[model samples]
Target chain A: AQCSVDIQGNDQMQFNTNAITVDKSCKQFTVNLSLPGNLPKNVMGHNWVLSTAADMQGVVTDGMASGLDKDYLKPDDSRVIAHTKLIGSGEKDSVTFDVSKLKEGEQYMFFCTFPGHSALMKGTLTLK
Target chain B: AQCSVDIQGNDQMQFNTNAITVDKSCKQFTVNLSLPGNLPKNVMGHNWVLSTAADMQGVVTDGMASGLDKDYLKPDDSRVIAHTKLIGSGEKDSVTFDVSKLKEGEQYMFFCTFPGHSALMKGTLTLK
Candidate 1:
């Protein structure tokens, strides 16, 4: 069984929730990210990125340097467990990752790597 | 001598230009804003706001509480002379205002008020 969740980002640099739970019975997990505002993608865009809590800052720093073409992420970054494509207003993006990649004891974080957004648009992901 | 110009916002919450000049001759001025990224608002959002350098922090603080429907701005805020709507990637928005609102000696600033963004996403606006 797989699990799914809906998350939203807004123009305020925040996510609707600060934490999410994943079930171990699922072989895969999916995250649906929505951008409900009317603005364009480049100005206030968002993406969902999964990585170890320790790697969050480094990933964001490198992502900023990568520019938009790479979706503000470092190429072949092993630290990233999964990520959705950048999306604009009225747009949606989803990502599915193998459940096996998650280790129960490790702490994970979900965030938007769009430059300054990660500061507020981040959340904790826990395996249950 | 007033001029109109185009500005860009990205998924990174940064404006493409660091400084803008306004001419004293123009009575009305316009600012065209574009978002070049693919992300949506809410996650990695951006907006253009203009205020006196002294008033920027206060304006942003009050604006954050105004929420998205108010475009993350305080309504009828006298401190704000001009601003574009919050925008997403690939979207465009513009604002026009009377140049008479500006004074030659006052310092002005332009920035994104999406929490934590102002640190790296601001610039000076000068009358020349």
Candidate 2:
């Protein structure tokens, strides 16, 4: 089953959903990230990134050091399974990854890599 | 007389207007700040603050130290002639100041004191 998930980031450093389950039949999964606030990207941009639970911290740390112009992510970082472009309020972006990349028993997580946001913007993703 | 002005901040770390002039006949002037993009406040909040030109640096520095809980401003900071609350994308805020506080020949400025924002978030304000 092809599947997609929608999530929202707001001014309060929160995600609308804390957990998402991908259908096991999906060949590919898509995640759509949106910022629902009215601020600009420079002051409050948000992006969605996916990685293994263990890789989350490394990806977020490198992303923060990469700065905003780079969308806060290290270019071509393999630890990142997928990611959407950074978005400002009212803006949206999506990323898709092959289900084959997900392991049935392993855990995945998604978060906003914007500096200081990952502390609260992360959530769990499971492949059922 | 009363007056108002509009300004914008973008992801590029730029303000749309670099200078503003207040009418000599106006007893009060209001500034309306608008962030035209779509981001949240925690990731990219913005605010407008007015103070003497010479006090700009000190205000911004001190404001950043205060963190977001205080709208990135020093509480009860006398140097601030006027200021608006912090806003995220699609949101707006305004502040009004007495013209009497501005001297005809003195220079003033407006800027976002969000942490790391003041480096490029400032513009001149002139009373004529």
Candidate 3:
């Protein structure tokens, strides 16, 4: 019913939700990233970054150079459609983006940009 | 092959290993706890508390009142054969307990006493 989807991430560098549904009816969509348990930003820290699946590697590589302080993301990177700040345990971060940004029949993904987290914390998002 | 065993915990309120083997040949056995990622203690804090499975509930109840500052354990709690401090991401802790304290053919468990953690962060420990 809502235009938003929820995701949970933990210190193991994993996400509880693997897929997301972006409703075409909504003008905007929200991605809610919640903490699975308590962990600090410096350790097991996480964030949600949205881009095409093909862009994941490039985004992560750029993020790795970006480091932890910047939430492991290059600032103002145009390729990112939507993103949430790096979060620790027991914390929540969300991002809302215009639905028009997504293309029909195009594949999109949400992933954490933190170091080594992308290995486990990644998921797919689609417009229905 | 060694007298000690290793356990890894992450922000998800879970442990990497579900069981441990403590070699009987050693006078004392060690438990090594490592973090899977970076998360601080206050958010998704974790610890390893060793006791018989039957003593689990009582210890956890007392620990709830003990609070995180105390590593969620009552001071000098006899039910605990050995324990490591509550830890956060990128951290490590260890505990070594005398083998004589355990009885042969007894069931022992190692769990996290942090609030909301004992439910998922637990495992069996056996002495051979």
Identify the candidate with maximal DockQ: 1
List RMSD in Å for every model shown. 8.5, 13.4, 5.8
Error of 3 at A15 (Å): 8.8
Displacement of residue B107 (Cα, Å) in model 2 is: 38
Cα deviation of B11 in candidate 2 (Å)? Answer: 19
TM-score of candidate 3 on Cα atoms, chains taken together: 0.59
Which runs in model 3 stand beyond 4 Å of their true positions? A2-19, A25-27, A31-49, A53-74, A77-79, A86-94, A111-123, B6-18, B32-47, B53-68, B72-74, B77-79, B87-93, B111-122
Residues A54-124 of candidate 1: C-alpha lDDT, one tens digit per residue: 99989898987787778889999989999999887899888989889998988999998887778788999
For model 2, the superposed segments whose C-alpha errors exceed 4 Å read: B1-128
DockQ of each: 0.22, 0.13, 0.06
Q: lDDT tens string, model 2, B50-126?
A: 99989998898788668788998999998999999988778877888888988889989888888656656788888
TM-score per candidate for chain A alone: 0.95, 0.95, 0.94
Instruction: Give candidate 1 regions above 4 Å deviation.
Output: B1-78, B81-128
Clashes of each: 26, 15, 12
* Top-lDDT candidate index: 1
Give all candidates' CA lDDT scores.
0.84, 0.82, 0.82
Worst 10 residues of 1 chain B by lDDT: B38-47
